[PDB]
Amino acid sequence: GGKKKVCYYYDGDIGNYYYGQGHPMKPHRIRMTHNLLLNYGLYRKMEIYRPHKATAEEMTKYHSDEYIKFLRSIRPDNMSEYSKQMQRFNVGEDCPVFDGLFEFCQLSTGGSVAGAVKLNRQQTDMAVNWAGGLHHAKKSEASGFCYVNDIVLAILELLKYHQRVLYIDIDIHHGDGVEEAFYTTDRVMTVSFHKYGEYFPGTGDLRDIGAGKGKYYAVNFPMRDGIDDESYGQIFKPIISKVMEMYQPSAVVLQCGADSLSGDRLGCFNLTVKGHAKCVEVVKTFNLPLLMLGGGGYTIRNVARCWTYETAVALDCEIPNELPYNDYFEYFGPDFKLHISPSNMTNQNTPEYMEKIKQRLFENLRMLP
Numbered sequence: 001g002g003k004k005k006v007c008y009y010y011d012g013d014i015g016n017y018y019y020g021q022g023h024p025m026k027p028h029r030i031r032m033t034h035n036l037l038l039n040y041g042l043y044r045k046m047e048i049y050r051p052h053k054a055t056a057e058e059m060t061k062y063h064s065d066e067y068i069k070f071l072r073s074i075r076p077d078n079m080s081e082y083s084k085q086m087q088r089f090n091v092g093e094d095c096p097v098f099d100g101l102f103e104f105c106q107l108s109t110g111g112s113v114a115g116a117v118k119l120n121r122q123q124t125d126m127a128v129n130w131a132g133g134l135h136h137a138k139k140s141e142a143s144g145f146c147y148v149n150d151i152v153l154a155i156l157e158l159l160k161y162h163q164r165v166l167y168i169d170i171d172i173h174h175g176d177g178v179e180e181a182f183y184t185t186d187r188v189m190t191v192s193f194h195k196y197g198e199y200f201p202g203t204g205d206l207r208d209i210g211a212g213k214g215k216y217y218a219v220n221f222p223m224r225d226g227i228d229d230e231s232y233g234q235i236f237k238p239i240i241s242k243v244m245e246m247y248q249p250s251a252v253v254l255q256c257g258a259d260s261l262s263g264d265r266l267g268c269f270n271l272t273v274k275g276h277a278k279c280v281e282v283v284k285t286f287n288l289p290l291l292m293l294g295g296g297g298y299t300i301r302n303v304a305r306c307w308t309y310e311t312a313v314a315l316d317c318e319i320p321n322e323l324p325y326n327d328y329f330e331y332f333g334p335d336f337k338l339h340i341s342p343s344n345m346t347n348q349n350t351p352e353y354m355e356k357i358k359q360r361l362f363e364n365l366r367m368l369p
């Protein structure tokens with residue numbers, strides 16, 4: 001279906017935001033990604049834009065005015081004055097107050113909304129925002145290191161021009177904030193694959209299918225530890241194909257959280273970069289306007305590898321396994337290769353479990369008109 005025009009969103013300041021000592025979320029991984037893909041020469045094939053800072057007006061298309069006013073006002077130096085408000089909005093522990101928190105939100109969000117605008121205007125086929133994908137943020141509360149739900153905001157932008165928008169989430173966590181925003185509408189179908197069972201956020205059971213007009217428009221594929229490329233690949237393509245057939249969206253948002261990779265400091269899946277990127281390849285085959293977003297990922301060398309390779313996939317550009325020299329070269333030792341190996345961990349997702357969950361979701365997809 002041809003090679004695609006790709007617009008890529010990046011602000012060079014993003015890597016300077018720091019969640020605090022010991023916090024596993026490292027915005028610097030976005031800068032490592034960017035530097036790696038520049039050193040592969042991928043800037044020659046795509047348009048690179050610096051996102052605007054999304055305004056409080058843009059954010060309150062979804063989020064409450066009280067919550068956004070709080071995020072814009074809270075700082076490490078006035079936290080004592082806001083103790084009550086911090087608890088109301090779930091800020092101060094997993095979602096710390098840090099210097100430049102609101103600007104981080106603005107840049108994360110600006111990339112996603114700007115990409116959606118570019119898609120709406122038919123000026124690109126794909127838009128990429130690796131600083132986006134903050135799927136846990138809720139209307140009036142922070143959650144799981146997420147403050148502003150850039151994904152929901154981008155989908156609201158797409159809904160100006162698209163009757164039906166499909167959201168797909170391959171982060172190891174359930175995309176609960178996105179699901180919740182659109183749970184009672186048929187104008188967005190949310191599809192999340194995630195680890196389920198004693199695992200954050202605790203949502204995304206098979207049986208959560210939407211409500212009201214949105215009944216059957218939320219799809220959740222709960223998984224166990226140790227899922228591998230072959231097991232994931234054999235459910236992802238059939239599920240997404242059936243979704244595309246039955247729902248017929250006109251735009252797609254794909255959250256590419258890299259915490260579903262093998263060796264992730266917080267995740268317990270066993271995907272390689274190739275296995276993760278196969279999801280991008282599958283979605284790309286439908287030739288629909290596509291917004292590719294970031295997400296989790298805590299082994300930062302593997303995040304940079306993953307999103308570099310997925311940018312190359314978006315561009316249909318073959319890149320060598322030998323990493324080019326770059327500003328973070330030592331982070332890619334001891335091998336200095338792009339691709340990763342799976343671990344020897346047991347896959348707790350038996351082939352029968354995978355088929356059975358698939359069959360249950362197919363029964364739900366038969367309820368669409």
Ligand SMILES: O=C([C@H]1C[C@@H](c2ccccc2)C[NH2+]1)N1Cc2ccccc2C1
Pocket residue numbers: 025094132133134135136144145146171173200257259266294295296297
């Ligand atoms: O990986 C996650 C969530 C965050 C989310 C994200 C993406 C991009 C930037 C900020 C945030 C990706 N998925 N986690 C939530 C959570 C909550 C509590 C203990 C560990 C974890 C890990």
Ligand SMILES: [Ca+2]
Pocket residue numbers: 169170171172173174175192193194
């Ligand atoms: Ca997910």
Ligand code: NA
Pocket residue numbers: 182183184185186187188189190210214217218
């Ligand atoms: Na929905």
Ligand SMILES: [Zn+2]
Pocket residue numbers: 171172173257259295296297
């Ligand atoms: Zn995650």
